[PDB]
Amino acid sequence: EFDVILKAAGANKVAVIKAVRGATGLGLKEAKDLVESAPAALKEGVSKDDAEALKKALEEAGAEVEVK
Template sequence: MIEKLAEKLVNLTVKEVTELANILRKEYGIEPSSLLLKSDNNKNIEKSSEKEEKSIFNIILKSTGASKLSVVKLVKEITGKGLKESKDLVDSVPSVLKESVNKKDAEDLKKKFEEIGAEIELK
């Protein structure tokens, strides 16, 4: 159960994280860390992380290519989302499909998408 919760938290969008922070603040009196809210600190963390070789990536769909249906099916498979949510992700290109994926898995997923004509960015 905890692992599923952790996976859901890791895959939240920025908007969802903001909503979660607001709920925690209003309903439970929990203040998010000021470090996470200050964009300057986040930029500094990102810059120091970029100096090291990246090992964790976000998978971003940039283009669906000619076979949109195949892309929707693959998005559904890798995200575990329903067909409608997967289609919505594909329709709202560019969109983050998966966050915090290790390098090997990210490259494997990128290869799968490229084989069906989609354009993927690892960031």
């Protein structure tokens, strides 16, 4: 089981907030507070394939992410 951590979004916050909402169903205020609060464990206990797909989706939106 793996964890996906949002390490930083920097200048790509708009894009990253959009990607985090699509991946999690969080409301706008909530996703915005999580991205603005990085580092943050966004998803914990996901399978290897789920973690690698979320990692890639956040990387394409412009975030610095870690899978542990």
